[PDB]
Amino acid sequence: DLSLSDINSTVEVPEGHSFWKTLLAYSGPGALVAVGYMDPGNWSTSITGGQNFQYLLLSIIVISSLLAMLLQNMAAKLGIVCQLDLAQAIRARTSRRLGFIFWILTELAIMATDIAEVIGAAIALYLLFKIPIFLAVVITVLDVFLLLLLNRIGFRKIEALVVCLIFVILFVFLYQIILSQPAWHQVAKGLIPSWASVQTSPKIGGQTPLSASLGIIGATIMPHNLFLHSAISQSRKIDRTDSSKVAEAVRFSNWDSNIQLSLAMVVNALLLIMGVAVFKSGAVQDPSFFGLYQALSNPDMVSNPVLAEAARSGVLSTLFAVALLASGQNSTITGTITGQVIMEGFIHLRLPLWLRRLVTRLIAIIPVVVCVAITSHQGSLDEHQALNNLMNNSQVFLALALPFSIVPLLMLTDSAAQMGNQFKNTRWVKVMGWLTVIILTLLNLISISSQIAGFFGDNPSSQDLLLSQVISIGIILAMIGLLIWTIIDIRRFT
Ligand SMILES: CCCCCCCCCCO[C@@H]1O[C@H](CO)[C@@H](O[C@H]2O[C@H](CO)[C@@H](O)[C@H](O)[C@H]2O)[C@H](O)[C@H]1O
């Protein structure tokens, strides 16, 4: 009846004021959440944003990472204080049909992330081991056994294995930046919140600064990682009776989370400056993982004689594919954990880790093998580009499930009927939190129409355009009705 019953309140190791050892003990949760923010679903957009705007968009990465740290810390607070996850709070404060809608929506979100991870991992196999594209996918389906071995390890090592992956993809991209020797003064200048990123005038590669910036801001948080953080934050036992101990517990998980999401922000920065310093100006014509592989393996695409010799040897691209693998491993852990959370929290369905990863991975690979089937039926022509368009079109479910995850979080944590007059949010985070939630909800409701129209490809059928307008209006209005309904129920609780 409590979230993550297998590992809930497992190891509590606060020892007086021995803080940093106490930090070492529970540092696990934050990395599990952050590694999701390094998935290859936006690797191209950081490199593309770098080529189109050298170092300019680095500040937007910082701001987005700050907002994500805010909402993530809020979810961790709900888990720590209330000893229950975000799904259990929402489901307890609304009916079952709303918990079911939220369930299917978040299932679709983690499914979209899973589609990104299976595409990137399968392509990683096609690049590293030269496995055929159709075989690499059905090889990625075998991660259920890696989950069986994953199940016996334990969170003191699982949450450290996630750290291992994090520093794998962090050192892979940092290594190609170390060889690049970039002008770190222009990087510093880029990290400062300037107003050139909010303008619309450069328009390089069909992208204005305001468009790229508003995209980075719009894709700030992942809805499933909120429920994830609120569930994993409970894995540390707390007496819930000593205010200094729970205040300490909140400091604990906060410093953890920021320590990890800061690493994710560093990875995004390494991707942008990877697009600025490593690649030549405009060398990336194919945002696909294969396009970045050949672009990282062509000496004329780099901007340094050392990167040309290393690229000719063939180490820059292989490291890239390794990073693709390490990123593709994340949805196997966090997808199963979060899927359990939203399942047994929203619809009260107790399912094992066996059938969970099976169903999610199958539903994820069905459109992948359909796409590979059609493109290989066209002669393996534009097969990687179509996989990239599938990966990008999948991310609409995140925009569908985002408001119903950030709005109830902010409400339930801002009410004293859930946190109490002692641990509710400061007036400082009330303003920043509501500002962030409003901005993200508006931006994603804007993204709905763009992605729904993007389903019909770059070929704008005049009759299908109006249909995309009707469907978009219907979807955003339906999300408005669901949103005001949820607002009404939660505010009835408070
Ligand atoms: C597209 C146009 C964009 C315009 C952007 C303008 C930004 C306005 C910021 C408003 O700030 C919040 O608005 C909530 C609504 O009025 C207030 O009530 C809130 O009060 C509690 C939080 O303190 C919550 O628990 C409640 O659910 C909620 O009603 C809340 O006090 C306040 O901080």
**CATH number where 295 lies:** 1.10.4160.10
Alpha-carbon 468 to chain mean position: 27
Distance CA(398)–CA(488), nearest Å, equals 23
Distance CA(308)–CA(278), nearest Å, equals 10
Give residue for tokens 């000593």: 242
Give residue for tokens 């007036």: 427
Give residue 244's domain range. Answer: 19-394
Provide the angle, in degrees to the nearest 10, between the axes of the packed helices 86-93 and 462-493. 80
Q: What's the token pair of residue 231?
A: 């569930």
Phi/psi at 221 (5° precision): -115, 160
Distance CA(229)–CA(246), nearest Å, equals 17
Side-chain-side CA neighbours of residue 258 (13 Å): 12
Q: What's the token pair of residue 381?
A: 């022509």
Q: What's the token pair of residue 103?
A: 């369930």
Short-list 342, 339, 334, CA closest to 355: 339
Please compute Rg for the chain using Cα positions. Answer: 22
Q: Is residue 408 part of a domain?
A: no
Ligand 1 atom with minimal separation from the 411 CA: 25
287 in Cβ contact with 93 (< 8 Å): no
Phi/psi at 279 (5° precision): -75, 150
Q: What's the token pair of residue 357?
A: 């990863």
Which residues contact residue 36 at a Cβ distance below 8 angstroms, ignoring those fewer than 6 apart?
Answer: 113, 222, 224, 225, 228, 330, 331, 334
The gap between the terminal CA atoms of the chain, to the nearest Å, is 24
Q: What's the token pair of residue 427?
A: 């007036």
Give residue for tokens 């991975």: 361
Q: Is residue 96 part of a domain?
A: yes
Short-list 357, 418, 490, 403, CA closest to 102: 403
Q: Using CB atoms within 10 Å of the CB of residue 105, give its burial: 0 to 12 exposed, 13 to 18 middle, 19+ buried.
A: buried
Ligand 1 atom with minimal separation from the 427 CA: 23
Q: Ramachandran region of residue 314, left (φ > 0), alpha (ψ -120 to 50) or beta?
A: left
What CA–CA distances, in Å, run from 355 to 141, 148, 320, 352?
Answer: 13, 11, 32, 6
234 in Cβ contact with 83 (< 8 Å): yes
78 in Cβ contact with 92 (< 8 Å): no
Alpha-carbon 494 to chain mean position: 31
Distance CA(491)–CA(219), nearest Å, equals 27
**Which of 93, 430, 483, 491 has most ligand 1 atoms within 8 Å of its beta carbon, as the pocket-test mutant?**
430
Q: Is residue 336 part of a domain?
A: yes
Provide the angle, in degrees to the nearest 10, between the axes of the packed helices 427-454 and 403-414. 170
Three-state SS letters, the chain: CCCCCCCCCCCCCCCCCCHHHHHHHCCHHHHHHHHHHHCHHHHHHHHHHHHHCCCCCHHHHHHHHHHHHHHHHHHHHHHHHHCCCHHHHHHHHCCHHHHHHHHHHHHHHHHHHHHHHHHHHHHHHHHHCCCCHHHHHHHHCCHHHHHHHHHCCCHHHHHHHHHHHHHHHHHHHHHHHHCCCCCHHHHHHHCCCCCCCCCCCCCCCCCCHHHHHHHHHHCCCCHHHHHHHHHHHHHCCCCCCCHHHHHHHHHHHHHHHHHHHHHHHHHHHHHHHHHHHHECCCCCCCCCHHHHHHHHCCHHHECCHHHHHHHHHCCHHHHHHHHHHHHHCHHHHHHHHHHHHHHHHHHCCCCCHHHHHHHHHHHHHHHHHHHHHHHHHCCCCCHHHHHHHHHHHHCHHHHHHCHHHHHHHHHHHHCHHHHHHHHCCCHHHHHHHHHHHHHHHHHHHHHHHHHHHHCCCCCCCHHHHHHHHHHHHHHHHHHHHHHHHHHHHHHHHC
Q: What spacing in Å lies between the alpha carbon of 383 and ligand 1's midpoint?
A: 46
Q: What's the token pair of residue 95?
A: 């009916």
Distance CA(478)–CA(360), nearest Å, equals 26
Side-chain-side CA neighbours of residue 439 (13 Å): 19
Which residue's alpha carbon is nearest to atom 2 within ligand 1? 438
The amino acid present at 261, given as its one-letter code, is L
- Cα angle: 49, vertex 54, 60; to 5 degrees: 55
Q: Is residue 468 part of a domain?
A: no
**Which of 410, 434, 437, 489 has most ligand 1 atoms within 8 Å of its beta carbon, as the pocket-test mutant?**
434
Q: Is residue 466 part of a domain?
A: no
334 in Cβ contact with 224 (< 8 Å): yes
Q: What's the token pair of residue 21?
A: 């050892």
Give residue for tokens 């005038």: 201
Short-list 406, 360, 444, CA closest to 108: 360
Distance CA(489)–CA(90), nearest Å, equals 10
Q: Of how many residues is the chain composed? A: 494
Give residue for tokens 């989950």: 147
DSSP β-bridge partners for residue 302: 279
Distance CA(150)–CA(237), nearest Å, equals 23
Experimental method: X-ray
Ligand 1 atom with minimal separation from the 414 CA: 25
Sign of CA dihedral 245, 344, 222, 479: negative
Q: Using CB atoms within 10 Å of the CB of residue 416, give its burial: 0 to 12 exposed, 13 to 18 middle, 19+ buried.
A: exposed
Does the Cβ of 247 fall within 6 Å of ligand 1? no
Distance CA(406)–CA(74), nearest Å, equals 10
256 in Cβ contact with 23 (< 8 Å): yes
Distance CA(23)–CA(249), nearest Å, equals 10
The amino acid present at 10, given as its one-letter code, is T
* Buried b or exposed e, range 140-177, using 16+ CB within 10 angstroms: bbebbeebeebeeeebeebbebbbebbebbbebbbebb
Q: What spacing in Å lies between the alpha carbon of 438 and ligand 1's midpoint?
A: 9
The amino acid present at 292, given as its one-letter code, is L
Task: Specify the number of domains making up the chain.
Answer: 1
Distance CA(349)–CA(455), nearest Å, equals 33
Q: Is residue 475 part of a domain?
A: no
Does the Cβ of 411 fall within 6 Å of ligand 1? yes
Which residues contact residue 397 at a Cβ distance below 8 angstroms, ignoring those fewer than 6 apart?
Answer: 105, 108, 109, 111, 112
Phi/psi at 302 (5° precision): -90, 170
Ligand 1 atom with minimal separation from the 415 CA: 25
Q: What spacing in Å lies between the alpha carbon of 416 and ligand 1's midpoint?
A: 16
DSSP β-bridge partners for residue 279: 302
Which residue's alpha carbon is nearest to atom 6 within ligand 1? 435
* Buried b or exposed e, range 265-277, using 16+ CB within 10 angstroms: bbbbbbbbbbbbb
Distance CA(287)–CA(47), nearest Å, equals 9
331 in Cβ contact with 142 (< 8 Å): no
Q: Is residue 34 part of a domain?
A: yes
Q: Is residue 220 part of a domain?
A: yes
Ligand 1 atom with minimal separation from the 490 CA: 27
Phi/psi at 412 (5° precision): -65, -35
Which residue's alpha carbon is nearest to atom 13 within ligand 1? 434
Q: What's the token pair of residue 363?
A: 């539903």
